[model samples]
Target: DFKVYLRLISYLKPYWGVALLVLIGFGMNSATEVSVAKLIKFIIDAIQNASRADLDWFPLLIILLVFFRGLGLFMGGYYTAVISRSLVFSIRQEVYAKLLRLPAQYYLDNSSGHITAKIMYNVEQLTAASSESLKTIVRDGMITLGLLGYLFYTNWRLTICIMVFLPIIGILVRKASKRMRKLSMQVQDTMGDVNHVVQESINGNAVVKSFAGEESEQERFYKSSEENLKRGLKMVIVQNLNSPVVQVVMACAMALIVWLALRPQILGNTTAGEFVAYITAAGLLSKPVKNLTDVNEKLQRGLAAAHSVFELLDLPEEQNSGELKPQLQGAIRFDHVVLNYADGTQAIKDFSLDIRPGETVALVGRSGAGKTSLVNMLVRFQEVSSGQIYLDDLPIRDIELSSLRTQIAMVNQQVVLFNRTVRENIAYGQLHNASDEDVIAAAKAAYAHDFIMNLPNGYDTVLGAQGLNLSGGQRQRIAIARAILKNAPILILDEATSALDNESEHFIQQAFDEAMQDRTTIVIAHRLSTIENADRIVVMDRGQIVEQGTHQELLAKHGAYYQLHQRNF
Candidate 1:
């Protein structure tokens, strides 16, 4: 509700020096422009009244004024460019940093395309608001105000008459700008959807083609793009209306100024040259006047962008209330945990379980069972509705999220990797201060070092998006390397090699053994053979824990796990 049209000039905190320079330069430039215009008037009046020989000083003075004007314009433009660029850079960096800290659910709910669009398209609008538009607002506004003051000083009666209609024009422009601000926010939000469509279509091109959904995909993309265009054009239309209205107001003011100047009783003894110079000044002032009118619309657009960005920045961050029990003894306990999704659908109902430190537990169930939901609790991805999850007998919520996450690492079936070198991908889980040797060691342990070294750029090779250049097995190995790098006491493996072929599966299984050693391992395994050696296995059905015991114990009972295991084979 409070997210639109809030100015963020303080966002330029890092560039205070440059900002000051820009302000000074713009002020100097405006002064120079007004001075030059007045100098021309002086030269004309002098030539008309002074002797031909008296023109000597006027020419030299005009040259000096030209030099100063050019210098001010150059400095003003250069400083504005620097300041605007700095603002764009700072905003981009802040947005990217916020994304990194955002909850996992944020990425899950919003597509990569949508996120990218918000960053690329909407942030660029903010840059315009800061740079080009901002410069015009300052420079044009000062010039217009100065010129108006001079006009009133020169002839108060004409200036007073000219200003009579300004309120009407001001009201219209204000109304138009108010509409533009609202429309700009809607347009920015819609662009996120547009970006999502293109991102999904391009990234999942193979799947769409395989399913023969290209036409449908195109239809959706076109609709999104079309909507973005419509909203954007609507904003521009509202903004454009201001120029004509402002121009008419200025034109009327000029006519009134001329009308007042011609009445000998009102403006006595006005010479032809003085009348001409006054008219010229009034005419020249129109550009700045129109600009001042339009600055409101640009400011509104910028404010709308800032509001959206602030909303994201204001979302509640992850809460980590757990104690500093790092290097947990690998114990896990869930005490009568009641959990549900955001929509109020219970995923785990009255679930209670405990496994001693360092015990390997496997959770098996049919498709709708609460297997995945249980593991999510351990990572604190979704807050439990009513429950207590403990690590080494301490409440999980008591630990700081960053510190808690450091004590655990999970490798999912669908591998996630950054578009970066193999070493960087492996090193991603650790803090930036981690040593190079540590990253290399983790890669070696996961059996990825050899394959990574053989790639085109070796360890330094940047992978294509989602590691497209790598095979499924390779992606899994790289993900494993990431978890291996974390070296947490608690390990979670959710179908880590479920999608790989037999040969790759065998290698991943071996890597799993080496990586899982002594850690309290929870394997959400689909294959019966994978969890056959688990120290404890829990079988789930619907949203409840229906059976619990060792793998052999469950198979002996011929229960849900037994039937599900047989069905899989």
Candidate 2:
């Protein structure tokens, strides 16, 4: 537990200069507090000796103390906030950077909600808890130490008596925290479900509306909310009860210490000023003592969050270490490639194929035939369990990942578009520098130009989130335009025209034919009719290639492709 804390604090090493200021600021503030009791004693003593009154330090002393106190308060609050906010930003930046570099498997293992929560929620909580606790510990700890120092100097006997009650007070406060944790965990679990339900309802709004599940969804939220409220109330009760009880215990200890100070020998030895100052300093200890105890719980909460943040930080990045950055001609040769999943199930088994540069090859397979896995491996999104894939006669693993991807463009069935203007979406990333004429040309090629022009602002009309404003066919066309604009030597069309109507598909087919000329293309299609004109069709079954031939050739052979065609296509 503490090891994680040490690691978390290591992140603060970069801001040590600011951290020093934070400490000094709190120390100065505590100095003002410590002086209050002594000031009270001096005022009472000066009033008693009114004949030789020393009123010189009246307004000047008061103004000077308050001025220093204000400065201390400003530095304390301002510098602590600075450190907390900076840490939050840095930790979140690191988390997001790690998210980008993590392998596809990491995403498969952890949900987007979980990762997003780590970035959005946990980072904020971690920073607030750690910094606030640090501030409290430093500030309150100084007050307690300073007050006790005064108490000891006034009368060590009474100070020692006060020390005896600290253990009893600490025990009373911590039991409530221990009780709070029990309920806090339950509250946390229920809140998790509440967030999960909310996220699903928002994302799956269509399903909920179609099913008319508003009442059922509300019921789910109701259950989670009710449980969360109950557990949270329990925690609050413990918190509320503990605060006063702890103070009462301290008061009882105070009553006893007061009684002892008034004993015969102690009463005469210590003057009225000294006696009252001692009691005032002792009373001041209660607040700091309680605050110091609070830090223990807060620190634990922060350390738990830190553990999660560090867990994400420590995940290994995707292994993309290839040095060659070739302008690939897209000649793909899968030499005995295999992919075995972690669960002992093989996704691909001894899959081997060779294609000439600029060739259009279609992969036709049933669901779970490992066709997608094979394509993912080509881009190193999934690593081969064994064997190799070569691109343009060079090992696929030897080519630089980004450069390798630059030579190929893919349009998936689920078209992904950002909430950006049509022009910007079409000319995204490396294509950002493309001229408007070229963007228009690509849109025209994809048969999307007419519809895009019909939108409110022509090409400048911004899309809704994930292009939700567009129809399915419209989104597909936009994706096609993006792919066409890329103008890469290689293209992978994974049901790229699935959303288009027959007439639109026909238009897209002609457009694709023009686009595919002299460019290597990989088409993964469930509809066999669309790929009849492909240069070759490779049928896959389970994890291996079952048959390879042209449309008519496969029909003549009565092979796996013929069987697949007979069954569904």
Candidate 3:
């Protein structure tokens, strides 16, 4: 955790020039504080000894100190903001970029709200730790040091007496900092929970309303919000109490100093002016001491947040070891593949199949029969626990991840359409380079051109969030159009037309017929009728193939496919 904070602080190196200026400004400001203590002594000396020359220059000196202090404050505050905000910008950019390269399983293991909260809330904590806390430490630290120096110069013996209590204050601060860090971690976790609850509710608003779960959702949100408040209040209690405890300890030391200074033996030859100036400088120490103690809260919170951010940054990204980017022949072979999840559940067991180039294969099975798992393995979303998968006789692990995915297009049952124009969404990512003519041709082939033309701005129409303004069938068709625009040699349709009505499905099937020609297609279907005309249907049960043949052949055999087909009908 300490190293994590050090690395975060290292971000300040780039702005070292401005940072040096900030340090100089603080030093000047500390000097002015010490000068005020000196001025008090000069005033006392001049009044008692009737020295008019001393009084004449004192006012001018005070004015000069005030002007310099003001300038110091401005430079310190301005440069600190500039540096901290820059640090935040760099951290956010790096974290956001890292998220794009994380493995698919990482996202599955973490909620979107938690991920976003790390980028937003956790990174801001680092700003407090790296910048705001640093400012307080540098500025108030200088003030405290300046006062201590003034105290010692006035009478070193009296200063030594006060120094006896330093270790006790240090003990209290150390204990308080530990508690603050613990509570800060709790606060960050509860904040993530609150974000998750709120984001989940907002994203699933339709389901909540349709199921009349508004009251339940409100209760869940209230619980999470209250949890966050409780943790926050605990942190506040620690942060608020630390300063007063340290202040009281210092006050006790100050009272003892005053008592000791009055003794003739301890006071020695100290003059009235010197004694009063020493006390005055000592008295001013409370505010800066309190600020230094309060800075611990910010420091701990930022450190806690930094730990989370650095932990994420340290995670290994998805492996892109394979370098093959050849134009694949679209022949896929699964040889004795096995997959076991962390929870000890085997999703696939010795699954082997050969899919020839340009073959249309339909995967028909009950839920959790490993159909989607097989597709996931084929795309390298999940690694095989044993054996290997090959594409055109080359092991898939030998192919570059991007090169492998680029040759495949997928249209799932739940279409994902971005908040972009009709044309832009169709030509997403690498497909953006597709010509306008090519985009139109793909849209037309997907049976989406007519409706897109009817939209308010035709091809230029901006979609609502997830294309909410369009019907389910329309969104599905738009996704199909995106796949069509890619023109990949291999396509995977996971219940692609499940959302469409029979009429719409008929038109889409026509598009699919044209699109699937000379392209290897894998269809994971829930509707048996849709895949009845498929070249081959592979029926799976319990992570193993139970039947494989043409629809009629499987029915004649009265095998697993026959029972499934009868149940669906």
Number of the top TM-score candidate: 2
State each model's C-alpha RMSD to the native: 10.4, 9.4, 10.4
| lDDT ranking, best first | 2, 3, 1
The Cα error of candidate 3 at residue 490, in Å, is: 1.6
Summarize candidate 3's per-residue lDDT along 400-434 as a digit string, tens digits. 66666676566664456788888888876665567
lDDT of 3 at 358: 65
lDDT of 2: 0.69
TM-score of model number 2 = 0.77
* Candidate 3 colliding pairs, count: 0
TM-score to native of every candidate shown: 0.76, 0.77, 0.75
For 514-547, candidate 1 gives per-residue lDDT tens digits of: 6666766766654445556666777666756677
Per-candidate clashes, comma-separated? 11, 0, 0
Best-first order by TM-score: 2, 1, 3
Cα displacement (Å) at residue 378, model 1: 2.5
C-alpha lDDT (0 to 100) for residue 181 of candidate 2: 68
lDDT of each model, Cα atoms only? 0.66, 0.69, 0.69
Candidate 1 lDDT at 349 equals: 68
lDDT of 2 at 318: 69
